[PDB]
Symmetry: D2
């Protein structure tokens, strides 16, 4: 596509997008065009408005576009073209990505005892309510656990809420502690969001006993 | 995929799917699996139910699956496996396609007079509220008009309702009447549904005057 | 989207799209924009060309866009804007849908004998190589058979060729002939294409014997 | 979906998936089912093989599934069910995600001089050939630069190669240096892959002069 300003909008919150170069107040020669999950290709929106789109996105007095409550289907491209009172045309191009932050992740069915030298289920980490899905990862004494490493096995599951579309993730960790290891290792699980610069969320740690 | 019974479900109406081979009343060893626009791959539903799926699809006492009001996102595959009291396992496989019937199509901005030998806009046909989109087509005195045949030009547009997802179609017909033709031709437009065996809907005819 | 000329392009064949209002020969101030399965939103193509797109779609000397061999991923929207030598700007807007015609459909595993009053497998109809998928339907003595009617059952299956993406459809018909019916009914199966105004393809008929 | 082992497969490389619990050599009672970008819902593959799938994925003598060169369309779910010689059934469930590593990112059109207190284009970072798209981000003297923080503006662009589907990303950085800042700041850009645990790639730094 073209060069755009990246916008991240939290699901359920309002979004205002500026129409650069629009006069401060009506009358304004400007048009918004959007291509999102709601549209078939481009939809044009104008300051006059009208119709079912008035429930979803409306042009404000200063020419900005306003969505009262962003949904998953509002992901897409939003563009404005405006003429100021001198006749200069200015374009605005936005790429809108939407997100939701899950609840704090939790470890369920954690083991209190592990046996060295054999596979053990350590626990299941669960995160509910993310968009985009994001990922779960396990840590041992502050270091990432890698499933490709020997003695670590992970299985993962993704589900969607049938009404909101938000993701629930589940990650089951199994480990084979090596003979002579730490008898009280500390495990935790982290949720890493799908979008850049969003912070990870971490579970409370667990500390099983390992039997030699 | 596998062999399935095809099911067409009107948006907004309930749907009941039979679990073949299930005992008539509980207790029943049966499981439903669905893969639809609501799910990430397969979701399992059981007679006990529970959780947010209880608002969307529930297993009934006789083991059938019930959706109180089908939506676009319920398109997909629905499967049951049941054991009867004899121990025999029976599988049911359904492919569910959803639809909505638009309002009767209308011709707007129809021309009252055409001039022979030059291009004329005849009118614009509009259909609102279909799923899947379907198509619009023009007829002249009961015969289909085919674009790219000489003297016929059509342009078409598709939009979606931002909240319901249903389609609005628009079709603009232009013709070049051939000299010596009928001075009072009769045009109409028809909506053809996307699914098989659904009936076409037709507009009232228009009858412009052609000037030689 | 906007009003467009609908274009149907057969997979594997060339496609030429006219840039209306472009000068007959270079130099030309014109630009093509396309949004297809190949692109992330709009891609701009110019008479100079260059790069990997030169293998897929190139602007010709008269300004038309040329694709030597259309694929499934070329479905989408193609637009031109040109200035003629007088300074007038002209826009062209095309909605391109692609298709492939399957081989003639065939009935396999047809029954030679049916028993009245009980369910019988009549046969399986198969169509290979369509795009979009299209549908199969059964006919009895020239009349459509409807699965919603008593004594008719149909199951259907869709597969895709892993390399070409073209669809293979299969339809299995079962019937319960009513006591006292025709002892030599004639069945056939028809493939109905997904796009409008494309012709159906029909199998050779079968003529089982029915036992009272 | 169900619990699965997550598998990451580099585009263009072979992939082997183990059928757990299968006998070491034929004969084997086992079946693979796949649902990927190539399939309509599930496709069953068997040790005998045959047909066009033999060019894409084949069952090996030990029952493993083999793809000689993974493509984007092989993303999806791969499952095996096998019986050993004892009669025990074992299931294997894999979620396959595909990727490609882009070339090292580069900064083009970097500025040699910036002026304090006014917006300046610093440069454009470009990464070619990734899957999934991934993201570009700017750093100043080793610290992430965050847009929407005062004096930082970023615009971004995504394109796809028309034949391979791989992504090219472009990111243009503008900054307003604050008066009294470092006259020789050091900027760099990093590519962050879409999949977890894949390493970032970084450009060579640039060091413009800032004029007070
Ligand atoms: C590349 C690019 C960036 C920002 C805005 C636009 C517009 C536009 C948007 C709203 C109204 C009129 C034109 C167009 C077009 O449609 O030509 N291209 C754009
Ligand atoms: C090919 C086919 C047709 C109909 C039902 C199923 C089921 C199933 C559905 C619900 C519960 C348990 C199994 C499965 C499977 O998952 O093996 N395959 C099926
Ligand atoms: C609604 C509509 C129909 C046909 C062409 C265009 C173009 C365009 C196409 C190629 C080059 C420059 C502009 C645009 C735009 O981008 O504004 N809108 C269009
Ligand atoms: C939940 C789950 C995990 C792993 C494999 C399967 C299979 C399967 C796969 C290949 C062949 C036969 C059955 C099925 C099914 O289809 O019932 N469910 C599975
Ligand atoms: Cl789900
Ligand atoms: Cl729309
Ligand atoms: Cl398939
Ligand atoms: Cl692109």
């Amino acid at each position: 596509g073209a060069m755009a300003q990246n916008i991240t909008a939290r699901i359920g919150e309002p979004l205002v997008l500026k129409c650069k170069g629009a006069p401060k107040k009506p009358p304004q020669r400007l048009e918004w065009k959007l291509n999102t999950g709601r549209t078939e290709a481009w939809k044009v929106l104008s300051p006059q408005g009208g119709g079912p789109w008035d429930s979803v996105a409306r042009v404000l007095p200063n020419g900005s576009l306003f969505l009262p409550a962003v949904g998953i289907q509002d992901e897409g491209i939003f563009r404005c073209q405006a003429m100021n009172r001198n006749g200069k045309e200015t374009k605005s191009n936005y790429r809108v990505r939407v997100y939701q932050i899950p609840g704090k992740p939790e470890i369920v069915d954690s083991a209190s005892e592990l046996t060295a030298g054999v596979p053990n289920k350590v626990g299941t980490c669960v995160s509910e309510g993310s968009y985009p899905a994001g990922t779960l990862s396990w840590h041992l004494d502050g270091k990432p656990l890698v499933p490709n490493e020997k003695g670590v096995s992970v299985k993962e599951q993704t589900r969607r809420h049938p009404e909101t579309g938000l993701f629930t993730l589940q990650s089951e960790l199994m480990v084979t502690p090596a003979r002579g290891g730490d008898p009280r290792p500390t495990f935790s699980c982290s949720f890493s969001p799908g979008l850049p610069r969003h912070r990870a969320l971490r579970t409370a740690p667990i500390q099983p006993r390992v039997w030699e």
